[PDB]
């Protein structure tokens, strides 16, 4: 179950973990460049749900 | 570690087999408390042909 | 003699259609196909 969820990033549970989305939590390390590899672990996302918002505030 | 606190927080899940006994008819007398005490994680290993 | 190197012991070997795909010297299950004396032409650019 944790390989599947960790292989798709569609985390679903009976509480929703109190999180605004049920996908997108996981990303490919995409080692095409050392810059990209180190940059992945210093990247932080405001979350997809705010990506859906039309505003910019 | 955080995971053992989590399993210490999930506590128990109780189920009564409808303890027939023939209070013994609405107090059942059939308690089953299922829980998880510890959670262990082991480093990756592979044994082939199984165990042996 | 065709060759296959064990990915984890370096030991050279020569697999056959009649043996287990495993390093007979270590027991690994991953084998690199060895390079041989085979002609390849190259334009020097």
């Amino acid at each position: 179950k944790m390989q599947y969820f960790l292989s798709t990033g569609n985390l679903v549970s009976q509480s929703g973990l109190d999180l605004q989305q049920v996908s997108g939590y996981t990303v490919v390390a995409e080692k095409i460049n050392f810059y990209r590899f180190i940059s992945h672990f210093r990247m932080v996302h405001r979350g997809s749900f705010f990506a859906q918002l039309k505003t910019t505030t | 570690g955080l995971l053992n606190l989590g399993v210490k927080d999930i506590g128990e899940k109780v189920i009564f087999d409808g303890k027939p006994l023939n209070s013994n008819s609405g107090y059942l007398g059939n308690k089953l408390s299922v829980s998880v005490e510890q959670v262990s994680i082991a480093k990756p290993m592979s044994n082939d042909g199984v165990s042996s | 003699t065709l060759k296959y190197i064990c990915a984890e012991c370096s030991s050279k070997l020569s697999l056959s259609r009649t043996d287990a795909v495993r390093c007979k010297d270590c027991g690994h299950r991953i084998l690199l196909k060895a390079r041989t004396k085979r002609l390849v032409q190259f334009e020097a650019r």
């Binding site: - | 082939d48 042909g49 | 287990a20 495993r22 007979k24 027991g27």
Partner: protein
């Protein structure tokens, strides 16, 4: 993987094979030219002759572990090169024969030739009990009609020599016993190998010549010793021949007899097992690290079961994590000197003391019968008193 007639044919074949391998080590060990080789061939050619005749679906043949040496024994007797007990002890001690394990062959494949009420039963099933050793030599003679075919069977003035030197090399006892043999021992005539005991009950008629030779040997010592009125053999002399003997190293021989003792049979040598005079202990482990390797080579097992095994041996690795010991006639000489000092109820006891010992020795090389032996003894005892 073959059952029935053709399964038998290669069980036949394999039997064919190992005997031949047996014979050539025979030549290397004894260097007894075309002669030893060809007589042995036709002997089994003769043996094969009969197997074909009662064929149809006759499966009584598959020879025993012993039939092969009986064959080589019969052929040698023809040639009259040696002896049985000596041959057997030598063979066990040096594994000269491939007799013990049947994996050799050239079979790899004959091995797989499945077993078919056969091939698996071949090569190294068990070690001989009592006559059993001959309980087939006679049968082979039966199959062979060997006595008519081959000259001078069971004979050998060499077994007598082997026997006197065997221990109390009392030079005079050679023709003492040769003389009693001369006497009533088949009307003063060299004992010939018994007949083709055709009957399956294999009665103990004791005609196995040697068995009687050893019997005359023992008797001779007892009688001659019992009545040496002139007192040619001193009271204190008899036990000396005992003290000197009771064990000792062996320029190969005694070490061999230990190796035969270790068939742990009727417990006459079992304890020798226990005792095993220090080094005897050591040269034993030497002969195990050399001739036990003739041991073996699990199959497939992903290399796994095997590798692990290799590692384990990698582990205890070991095998080393006057040339000292002496030859046969050296030991023989030195105990003949250890008795160097030659020139009532007690001596009788000493004599019985000594006879039990030889009974141990001669009996131990052979199928014994801690009484057939003496049954045998009893027999000629009876034979004798018709003067």
């Amino acid at each position: 993987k073959l059952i029935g007639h053709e399964a038998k044919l290669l069980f036949l074949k394999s039997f064919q094979f190992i005997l031949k391998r047996q014979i050539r080590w025979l030549i290397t060990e004894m260097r007894f030219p075309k002669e030893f080789e060809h007589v042995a061939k036709i002997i089994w050619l003769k043996i094969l002759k009969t197997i074909n005749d009662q064929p149809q679906e006759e499966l009584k043949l598959q020879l025993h572990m012993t039939s092969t040496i009986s064959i080589l024994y019969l052929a040698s007797t023809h040639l009259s090169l040696p002896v049985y007990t000596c041959d057997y002890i030598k063979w066990i001690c040096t594994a000269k024969m491939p007799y013990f394990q049947a994996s050799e062959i050239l079979p790899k494949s004959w091995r797989i030739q499945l077993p078919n009420y056969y091939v698996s039963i071949l090569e190294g099933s068990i070690s001989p009990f009592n006559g059993q050793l001959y309980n087939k030599i006679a049968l082979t003679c039966g199959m062979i009609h060997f006595k008519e075919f081959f000259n001078s069977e069971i004979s050998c003035q060499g077994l007598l020599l082997k026997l006197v030197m065997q221990c109390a090399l009392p030079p005079e006892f050679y023709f003492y016993t040769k003389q009693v043999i001369e006497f009533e021992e088949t009307d003063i005539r060299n004992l010939t190998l018994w007949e083709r005991t055709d009957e399956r009950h294999t009665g103990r008629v004791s005609n196995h010549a040697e068995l009687r030779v050893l019997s005359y040997f023992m008797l001779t010592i007892n009688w001659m010793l019992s009545f040496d009125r002139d007192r040619q053999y001193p009271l204190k002399w008899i036990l000396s021949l005992t003290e000197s003997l009771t064990q000792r190293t062996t320029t190969s021989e005694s070490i061999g007899r230990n190796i035969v003792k270790v068939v742990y049979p009727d417990k006459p040598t079992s304890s020798d097992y226990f005792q095993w005079s220090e080094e005897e202990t050591l040269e034993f482990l030497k002969w195990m690290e050399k001739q036990f390797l003739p041991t073996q080579t699990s199959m497939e097992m992903t290399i796994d079961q095997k590798i692990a095994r290799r590692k384990l041996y990698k582990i205890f690795p070991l095998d080393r994590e006057d040339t000292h010991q002496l030859t046969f006639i050296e030991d023989l000489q030195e105990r003949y000197a250890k008795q160097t000092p030659f020139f009532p109820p007690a001596r009788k006891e000493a004599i019985g003391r000594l006879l039990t010992h030889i009974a141990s020795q001669l009996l131990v090389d052979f199928a014994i019968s801690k009484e057939q032996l003496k049954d045998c003894i009893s027999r000629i005892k009876n034979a004798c008193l018709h003067r």
